[PDB]
């Protein structure tokens, strides 16, 4: 006998863990879990319908930036999986598995788990050219990066090369990056920086990597697809309950036709209308 109200006005304040598979990032952004920040090792190869990113999340590894951050974040979020497939690249002539004191894993100098810091070997950094063929029937996503040393001395001691150059190509595309040597403010006492890039390799296409220095190399690929998973920023706790619709303010019932809680929703939801 309630009077008709077609607008859902309130949320339960929490996000229900059913029926959608919720992955709570806690202290880890999706990108940090993608790259393999040591504090994010528990996220390896996890799957999700909705990844939830928290305001409190923070980075605790080598200071980096991602020029096309939103597109990479959206690429992984929609695939719904962090499953990583290692591949054996032929890195002949260089030293692998560089580590840093800004990235501690188990009380030891370490690095992003999914990236490979290549440096000179006996003060020789040859012109690397490696290929990876992609014989699968899905797209491959490769994450790589460029290291920006702080001085010419740093560049020389790391890569035995004053001018590193990186090119990552497929039959469809070409990406060329040049390191920028210079002082940045110290983040966790590190005045250097890394820039993260990504490349999609479609089935039947080949990945080609050329580098004369400064390459933060991939260790393999992620499977990518424009699926139905997504990502959301929210500080609402994950609770035990069942609710088909999810907003950053918490889960919502889907019986009313309309909704004024949040423009951002996930699942089967009422249509948003303003206040």
């Amino acid at each position, epitope marked *: 006998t309630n009077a008709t109200e077609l607008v859902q006005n309130s949320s339960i304040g929490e996000i229900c863990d059913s029926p959608h598979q919720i992955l709570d990032g806690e202290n880890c952004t999706l990108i940090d879990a993608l790259l393999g920040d040591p504090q994010c090792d528990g996220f390896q190869n996890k799957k999700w319908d909705l990844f939830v990113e928290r305001s*409190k*999340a*923070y980075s605790n590894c080598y*200071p980096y930036d991602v020029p096309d951050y939103a597109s990479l974040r959206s690429l992984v979020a929609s695939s719904g999986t962090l499953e990583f497939n290692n591949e054996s690249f032929n890195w002949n002539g260089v030293t692998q598995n560089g580590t840093s004191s800004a990235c501690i894993r188990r009380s030891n100098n370490s690095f992003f788990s999914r990236l490979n810091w290549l440096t000179h070997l006996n003060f020789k950094y040859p012109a690397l050219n490696v290929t990876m063929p992609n014989n699968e029937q899905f797209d491959k996503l490769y994450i790589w990066g460029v290291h920006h040393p702080v001085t010419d001395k740093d560049q020389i001691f790391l890569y035995a090369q004053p001018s590193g150059r990186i090119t990552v190509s497929t039959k469809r595309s070409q990406q060329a990056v040049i390191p920028n040597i*210079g002082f940045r*403010p110290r983040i966790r006492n590190i005045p250097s920086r890394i820039s993260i890039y990504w490349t999609i390799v479609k089935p039947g296409d080949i990945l080609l990597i050329n580098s004369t220095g400064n390459l933060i190399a991939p260790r393999g690929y992620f499977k990518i697809r424009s699926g139905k998973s997504s990502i959301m920023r929210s500080d609402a706790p994950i609770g035990k309950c069942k609710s088909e619709c999810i907003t950053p303010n918490g889960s919502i019932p889907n019986d009313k036709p309309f909704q004024n809680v949040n423009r951002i929703t996930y699942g089967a939801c009422p249509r948003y209308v303003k206040q």
Partner: antibody, heavy 130, light 104 residues
Framework: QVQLQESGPGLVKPSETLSLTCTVS??????????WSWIRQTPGKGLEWLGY???????NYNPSLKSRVTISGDMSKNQFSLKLKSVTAADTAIYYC??????????????????????WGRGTLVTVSG | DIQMTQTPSSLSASVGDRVTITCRAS??????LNWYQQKPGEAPKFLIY???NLQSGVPSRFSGSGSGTDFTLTISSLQPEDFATYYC?????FGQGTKLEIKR
């Protein structure tokens, strides 16, 4: 190390164009990760950022200074200059040149624009008076 | 557009004391806040970057903390040479400053 040093007149008449030049020693003024800035300090305001300039032609200025500010550079001389039009007594200040930069770093779940000024000159007093 | 409030404007503390200086933004600024130390007759010195990262030449007794709107600069054990004016800074705006005198 890299060092900055301001040069210019210490007394400027009102309605004149204040001009100061910063000379950079030991560093590559040519590197587009750095911008080159001017900040002034008066007791009664403290520090006030005036503007910065990238050699690539990009620049950014304090809107409080109604576009009276122009910063330009010359790499033949490893120098950049401040120009401040139509000065009055309110422009009497200690003027500093500074090096800094802009970073787009993710932290607190959101990428934000960060500015900084990591290297400063010694500063120069400019008195605007008749 | 964003204005920061530094408290207190001035204070005195003894050698060995722990002093904390607060900067508060009118809006959230994430962690995009830096600190500078200006000793008398000198230009400001780059102290802390992105709320908590100590810069080169900064003694270990300096630390910073905060997120969103409330940020603090802490000197764990005050020294006579720490006499200076301290400034917070976010993008193109500086705090009003905090002058720190050494009690004696």
């Amino acid at each position: 190390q890299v060092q900055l040093q301001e040069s210019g007149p210490g007394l400027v008449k009102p309605s004149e164009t204040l001009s100061l030049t910063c000379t950079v020693s030991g560093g590559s003024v040519s590197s587009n990760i750095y911008y080159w800035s001017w900040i002034r300090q008066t007791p009664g305001k403290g520090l006030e950022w005036l503007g910065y300039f990238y050699h690539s032609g990009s620049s950014n200025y304090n809107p409080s200074l109604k576009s009276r500010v122009t910063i330009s550079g010359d790499m033949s001389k490893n120098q950049f200059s401040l120009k401040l039009k139509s000065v009055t007594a309110a422009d009497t200040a200690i003027y500093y040149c500074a090096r800094g930069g802009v970073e787009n770093l993710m932290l607190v779940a959101v990428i934000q624009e960060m500015w900084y000024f990591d290297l400063w000159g010694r500063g120069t007093l400019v008195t605007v008076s008749g | 557009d964003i204005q920061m409030t530094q408290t207190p404007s001035s204070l005195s503390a003894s050698v060995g004391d722990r002093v904390t200086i607060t900067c508060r933004a009118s809006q959230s600024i994430g962690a995009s806040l830096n600190w500078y130390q200006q000793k008398p007759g000198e230009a400001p010195k780059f102290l802390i970057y992105a709320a908590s990262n100590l810069q080169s030449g900064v003694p270990s007794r300096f630390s910073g903390s905060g997120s969103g709107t409330d940020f603090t600069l802490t000197i764990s054990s005050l020294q006579p040479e720490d006499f200076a004016t301290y400034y917070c800074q976010q993008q193109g705006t500086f705090g009003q400053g905090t002058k720190l005198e050494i009690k004696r």
